Design a protein around this ligand. Structure first.
Ligand SMILES: [Mg+2]
Ligand SMILES: [Mg+2]
Ligand SMILES: [Mg+2]
Ligand SMILES: [Mg+2]
Ligand SMILES: [Mg+2]
Ligand SMILES: [Mg+2]
Ligand SMILES: [Mg+2]
Ligand SMILES: [Mg+2]
Lengths: 386, 386, 386, 386
């Protein structure tokens, strides 16, 4: 019955199940959770691990002794449960000092502080076993046009990521970075607003091999984009280092619904792609149990994230394995799509009369793609209506 | 009075002023224009040049003799007016053969045909003096998830662009390519949906230096993105080879309103950026006079494109030159944004107690950014209310 | 196996399966269908009936003799199959005369013509047995602010609908009107853009009882609205006279995908509502088989519309009948939602200390809504994962 | 120089300039303001008045003595400045008790409490001189489909508004209600999501004359709708009782930018309409100075709201008064739009051969609307480029 186990690599941020329910118009509806209790409850649900921002694990402004004790208790919870910490990140968005950004703040002293804060937490992430270090620059951007020269900001962003790369290399760390795009919220427009923009930016870094993307379902959907398509481009680039899974109902504030909620068919095609491509990273949920829920509803919502992934995995696998679907894929020429256009080379193509002079465009145009039959087979598989 | 002259480099597609007004629910409202008459009328308005798809200039399926005559008449119109042709492109979207794409059609024979059709028109573009060859893959994409394996499609897309690069190099042509992203329409989702995705893709081509982007105002706005920000990232990458200017009112079908219509403040910030950055390419309008208009309204709408650019240019220049604005920019630390974060280097940053151990985060947080005063100065300049 | 029969009341517009595939960037990909062949093929799939615009059934500009023959052949097809015509409508959008509207065209002569064209087709609709006459004012609206004074346009719109009401009353017809909102496309903004705006407008008509709404799934979703919620408000008002079923992937051009495609969970909640509320009107599909498809794909896509409705009907009924769901609904206080707030009356409420002076707000706030467990039961039912 | 005075009727919510800057990802960036200091500073800027939620003026949970003192100090500030309080409202969204709604909470005890809380504040609003009582049901709605039966919720909503109407009538108050639609945020979907839905709902209330709408610029724009068009429909219905002015950049979280920011041309057309129609209510700003700003930036942003209104008022008036624009309006047949379609009556229309049998559709279709010239005159007026 779609029961998750640690082998499924499901992970959750401390800040997900720990979200107290404050929104722009509302006070908290739930008490803060001790990270130790979240680690235990998530393990009981079949999670593999957790993730953290610095300030989720150690309250901002903690003394060294307080820091040591927070980490010691967390380590004990990991040891008590067998949970892992595959990813960590920095909070460069909550404190009012970051109101115009961390790495791209107009104030240079803030940019330097943001880097120091990040570096401190990279060390801790490595200590706790993380393989990936996420950077979500939620405050990088603007509400107005004069406030932020974007070329200058990208220069500062590159400078910051290059320094972080220099740092991890200098320490001999194996950890890699994953840049998380988002189009807007909390800034009017956020820099690196989509998977594409982040992929493009990485190519200008000094050591691009150290950086990939951490796409989030709802973020791409906040720009009305196709999340599976963006994931495909990230995979094509060799840059899908981590992923954030959740749900979103279209173009609006980021909802962070449990995975499977929001756009259900996009969730199906996403799981199909991740599984077909052999993505081996964490299946990480960056979601918020709605603030309508109590403590029991938090765990139900977390359980639902994993359940929905597993149902979709089953249905996508059944779709791909069905001989009738395999026939439909051939009827729609998906096999042809995967063959080179012109392995014969440019001159051969130029000399090939079947490619122009004697190409029967009308006969080709008349051939239906048979995509609707294929898609209804996909629908039938998703719904268990075969 | 904001009168354009050829020195302003304003250009228009034949298909813009020549749009007959067919939309998904409506028949044509205007007769087809002879390209010769468009060249003359645009010249009279102060345009610098025009652009074309193959099939705008030579009707699809024309004989060699018909082709020669269409080109001869067009050349005479250019010679009669002094108009230039700085850019051309291929129509890989109208004919039903392209219903699943050109370069990424599932049918291999269609992909080969698309390449041959493109190559033929590259030769003509070069003959007519074009410096840039645009590719808008409007049919590349899908309505359903099973129809298009996006990694395979990107492999085919790369194969196509690499072959085109091989071709231009083999002929010793100086022409460069500009890939035009669009998020959707006419496909449910289009591949390379934003400037970022196109920039990222280019980095995987064999000869990336031959390819840039041709962003269109309304296309990025169809994903709710900030067009000036995307242009800034393209400029930062050295990839703004051409641009398509128009207007769009938010997230909906692509409207192709005249430039300045739609998001007026985004048009202001765009012009500010293009002028500040010294963009030297064509100011090309890819727009449609609304189908409500007659022949006189077509030319009024085209004239308005250029007028609005020139008004915005004046106001943006006045904004940047105003000593009160220059003071406000310093008050908002735009000067600091342009200074390196850590030219002192990583070790110096790590050793700098002013960056962490002794950084007064509260004092920094308390410093207002003064962005609202800056933005109201920008508003006052735009509106001529200083 | 989810096989439709005429008893399910599934209907289709002639223009749906008959869509030739022209889009703003593309020529037709399919030949025109004879309405007679559509009636036969739809009947073979288990449809109950069809619908038409005037100009779908009788080519625009037909002579009286041509008109009679088109109608005679159509009547014979209905008689040969047992198909019904429960709804008809007017094409007030294709012909260039309607470029600024029908009923709200700025030109008064066009407004008068639009009314005459509509009245002629009301007579034919009644002859063919229609119970509902739809009006989709797709050209009513504007691209620019000065072009259309909306108060004046609403005065003209009211005048038109009042005249149509006067007409049907004068003829003793039983037919009722259903106004179809759409937010945009083909106009930049369309008047009466949502279900709410149309419902509000109807209340100002002289005989509001003669008018309801014909909401379309994708239209409300083009404004990012919740289609089931809008349908609920229409039902609450007693105004759901007809419905148009299709699919849409978010905020973009209207896609007109087959029903069940697009937002699958919204389709589930829609069917749940229509069935729970006992909606007894046609289940009408206003969709377009994608232009990728041939003749066989058209019929597959049409069949899929009906199949998906029937699957969703089964799953929604199972959800509502499941004792575990019934318990979850009580746990979430859906029963309380359906009880009056203050049947005791205003003075009793004012005098009730349990409602304010002695209301334990903290205890009430602490009660979780249990919505996530409820929603995961709904997901499990939809996916056949109980 | 566009200097506001109290005669312009500009008003501001206490919660606007008083916004501390908490957003979903960020802590406060500004200290709380004493309402007394806001009243004084706003008066100094030329405001006419302020507005409040109950809990802005009197901290939630205040004792009777504390309440009296808060009100006494506020009254003194009004008296010291000459400021008015034309509108007040209830906070039915911040406290966790309202997590599933106030008037449409599933819990009946919460619905009763919401009504009592509202009634208490209606009394205070009347004492302080308010003419309008706003209701923004920001928590009314759902994240998931099973959580909220919308027909039942609308029954509860009607019951609540009817009770409030009964209450004000019983007390002999002159105050009227204004329902504020919003499409989403903080709920996934909010009930009464647009002006149209709210107008439609009002028509089902027992005493509809007591209720109008309070539309907010950014709210309609969050559904991609045309705010001026919605205002026109509200005016057409006689229901524009109050308005909330701000800015919004498209479809995303509600930004609450200062008025004039966001969609500048929509702001122009809005002011044109309000002034042309003779709207006499408050010009109320419901905005948030961005959290980047300090105390000085708050007042600059507030001043900008009023300045932008006044600039736009000047330009719209100049547009309408320009004889060249008046000629263009006639050329575009705006005069015809304002004339009845068929004051001659239905039978005369049916008998009028010029309306059908002898209507030259082709000649009518050929007449351009001249909307682009009109719109460029509007652009030139807005930009001071005539
Ligand atoms: Mg998120
Ligand atoms: Mg995330
Ligand atoms: Mg375009
Ligand atoms: Mg273009
Ligand atoms: Mg449609
Ligand atoms: Mg429809
Ligand atoms: Mg707001
Ligand atoms: Mg408001």
């Amino acid at each position: 019955n779609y029961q998750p186990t640690p082998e499924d690599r499901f992970t959750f941020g401390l800040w997900t199940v720990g979200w107290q329910g404050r929104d722009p118009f509302g006070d908290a509806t739930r008490r803060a959770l001790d990270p130790v209790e979240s680690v235990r409850r998530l393990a009981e649900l079949g999670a593999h691990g957790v993730t953290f921002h610095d300030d989720d694990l150690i309250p901002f402004g903690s003394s060294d002794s307080e820091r040591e004790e927070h980490v010691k208790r967390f380590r004990q919870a990991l040891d008590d449960t067998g949970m892992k910490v595959p990813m960590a990140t920095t909070n460069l968005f909550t404190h009012p000092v970051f109101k115009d950004g961390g790495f791209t703040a107009n104030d240079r002293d803030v940019r330097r502080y943001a880097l120091r804060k990040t570096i401190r937490n990279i060390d801790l992430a490595v200590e706790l076993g993380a393989e990936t270090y996420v950077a979500w620059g939620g405050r990088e951007g603007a509400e107005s046009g004069g406030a932020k020269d974007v070329r200058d900001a990208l220069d500062r962003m590159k400078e910051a990521f290059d320094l972080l790369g220099e740092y991890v290399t200098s320490q001999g760390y194996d950890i890699r970075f994953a840049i998380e795009p988002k189009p807007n919220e909390p800034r009017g427009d956020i820099l690196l607003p989509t998977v594409g923009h982040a992929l493009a930016f990485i190519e200008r870094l000094e050591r691009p091999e150290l950086y990939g993307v951490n796409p989030e379902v709802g973020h791409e959907q906040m720009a009305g984009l196709n999340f599976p398509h963006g994931i495909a481009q990230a995979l094509w680039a060799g840059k899908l280092f981590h992923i954030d899974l959740n749900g979103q109902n279209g173009i609006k504030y980021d909802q962070d619904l449990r995975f499977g909620a929001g756009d259900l068919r996009a969730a199906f095609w996403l799981v199909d792609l991740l599984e077909s491509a052999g993505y081996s990273g964490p299946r990480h949920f960056d979601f918020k149990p709605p603030r309508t829920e109590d403590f029991d509803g938090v765990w139900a919502s977390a359980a639902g994230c994993m359940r929905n992934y597993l149902i979709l995995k089953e249905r996508a696998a059944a779709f791909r394995a069905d001989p009738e679907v395999q026939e439909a894929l051939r009827a729609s020429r998906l096999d042809e799509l995967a063959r080179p256009t012109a392995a014969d080379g440019l001159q051969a193509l130029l000399d090939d009369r079947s490619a122009f002079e004697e190409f029967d465009v009308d006969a080709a145009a008349a051939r239906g793609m048979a995509f609707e039959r294929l898609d209804q087979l996909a629908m039938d598989h998703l719904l268990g209506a075969r």
